[PDB]
Amino acid sequence: SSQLSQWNYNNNRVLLKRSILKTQAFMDQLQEENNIRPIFIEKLHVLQLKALSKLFHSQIVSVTNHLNALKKRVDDVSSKVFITGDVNTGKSALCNSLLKQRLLPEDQLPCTNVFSEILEARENDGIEEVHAIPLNIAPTLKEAIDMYSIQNPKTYEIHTLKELPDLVPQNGKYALLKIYIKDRPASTSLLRNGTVDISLIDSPGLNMDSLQTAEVMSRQEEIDLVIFVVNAENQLTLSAKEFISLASREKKLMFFVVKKFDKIRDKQRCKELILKQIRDLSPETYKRAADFVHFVSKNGDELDPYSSSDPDPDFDSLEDSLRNFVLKKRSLSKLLPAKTYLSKLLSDIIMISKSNMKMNLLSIKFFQSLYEGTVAQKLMVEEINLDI
Ligand SMILES: Nc1nc2c(ncn2[C@@H]2O[C@H](COP(=O)(O)OP(=O)(O)OP(=O)(O)O)[C@@H](O)[C@H]2O)c(=O)[nH]1
Numbered sequence: 001s002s003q004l005s006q007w008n009y010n011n012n013r014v015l016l017k018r019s020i021l022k023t024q025a026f027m028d029q030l031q032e033e034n035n036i037r038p039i040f041i042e043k044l045h046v047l048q049l050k051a052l053s054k055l056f057h058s059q060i061v062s063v064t065n066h067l068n069a070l071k072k073r074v075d076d077v078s079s080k081v082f083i084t085g086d087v088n089t090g091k092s093a094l095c096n097s098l099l100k101q102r103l104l105p106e107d108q109l110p111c112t113n114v115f116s117e118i119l120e121a122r123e124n125d126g127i128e129e130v131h132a133i134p135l136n137i138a139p140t141l142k143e144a145i146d147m148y149s150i151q152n153p154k155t156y157e158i159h160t161l162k163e164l165p166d167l168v169p170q171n172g173k174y175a176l177l178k179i180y181i182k183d184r185p186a187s188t189s190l191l192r193n194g195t196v197d198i199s200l201i202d203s204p205g206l207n208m209d210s211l212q213t214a215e216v217m218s219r220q221e222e223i224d225l226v227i228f229v230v231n232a233e234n235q236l237t238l239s240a241k242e243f244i245s246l247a248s249r250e251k252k253l254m255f256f257v258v259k260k261f262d263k264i265r266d267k268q269r270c271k272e273l274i275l276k277q278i279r280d281l282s283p284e285t286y287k288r289a290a291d292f293v294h295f296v297s298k299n300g301d302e303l304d305p306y307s308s309s310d311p312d313p314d315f316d317s318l319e320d321s322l323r324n325f326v327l328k329k330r331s332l333s334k335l336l337p338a339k340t341y342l343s344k345l346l347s348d349i350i351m352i353s354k355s356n357m358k359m360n361l362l363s364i365k366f367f368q369s370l371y372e373g374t375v376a377q378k379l380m381v382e383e384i385n386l387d388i
């Protein structure tokens with residue numbers, strides 16, 4: 001019944017693009033309303049709030065920018081996996097496990113300073129090479145990543161894969177590293193499987209630089225699936241929770257990979273501490289913990305280690321759930337972030353229109369029209385069924 005999944009995905013994908021449109025329209029009529037007569041302002045899930053009028057304008061501009069990324073993600077047929085977490089938690093060490101090769105530098109000391117995107121060579125004419133995107137080709141980091149084209153040499157420097165160790169630390173020169181690799185049967189490899197185009201992004205560590213952390217939180221809304229690696233010894237830190245909290249505004253579900261669990265003495269107590277924090281941070285991920293919470297110890301430094309077919313039940317299980325989620329449940333893996341965000345945002349608008357109507361007439365009529373309009377929309381969003 002694999003064809004049924006395709007139809008359901010294309011039907012649900014059609015439904016969400018329509019909802020992002022109508023909600024973007026709502027976002028705009030709020031912006032124009034605010035400008036002529038500032039709006040008057042229980043916790044708002046998305047909107048964080050003369051001072052409120054200018055901050056309001058800043059908020060809508062962010063939501064407008066976020067809906068665009070979601071619009072661009074729903075349209076995109078590929079799935080993007082974002083491996084982030086604290087510094088020195090094993091983000092790069094988890095990627096190597098997934099590719100089954102020591103591609104990305106993994107070191108005791110801080111290493112990854114530049115975003116490392118790993119793609120199949122098919123996109124780069126089947127050529128195994130790194131494409132470094134310079135910071136100086138555009139004003140901001142995103143503007144550079146977004147102007148990158150393989151067909152325009154002025155947007156990237158070509159290096160070899162073994163050049164990676166000397167490239168990833170140059171976060172003052174490069175904006176992103178496009179790594180094109182070639183895989184191994186198709187039923188075993190993750191990048192090339194014949195059904196869904198995946199690209200892994202090895203994130204720089206959280207809790208390192210004020211600017212670097214701003215980069216990660218930004219990049220989060222242009223990816224589809226998050227694998228949050230956790231240091232078993234520290235659990236979920238304030239730097240981690242600040243990210244997850246902001247990421248949970250759209251990602252109801254996401255993976256949690258606890259690494260360095262082999263170093264833990266009180267393994268049970270440590271496991272119960274971690275699980276306690278996922279229930280409070282990602283309540284929906286806790287309900288499906290068996291699928292989304294994994295304890296993987298595989299690494300290349302402690303006793304090519306990734307090629308060995310030695311039995312690794314912990315990792316094998318994670319890699320299975322990832323395949324199942326990204327490949328067999330495209331409705332959940334790709335579109336759930338869109339449905340979740342829309343439902344959160346619409347609730348916010350509904351609250352705003354609520355406090356404004358009844359208690360100039362021009363605003364009373366405007367907000368009643370918007371309350372009845374968004375309540376109706378939020379009802380249609382909830383009718384979208386993605387658990388099929
Ligand atoms: N015993 C054990 N060591 C691990 C585990 N995961 C990573 N390590 C070790 O700790 C180091 C961490 O590897 P990295 O991938 O570079 O960690 P990171 O998150 O990428 O840190 P930065 O990229 O610099 O931000 C490696 O040298 C590993 O040998 C684990 O699950 N168990």
Ligand SMILES: [K+]
Nearest residue numbers: 107109110111
């Ligand atoms: K490191």
Ligand SMILES: [Mg+2]
Nearest residue numbers: 092105111112
């Ligand atoms: Mg790293």
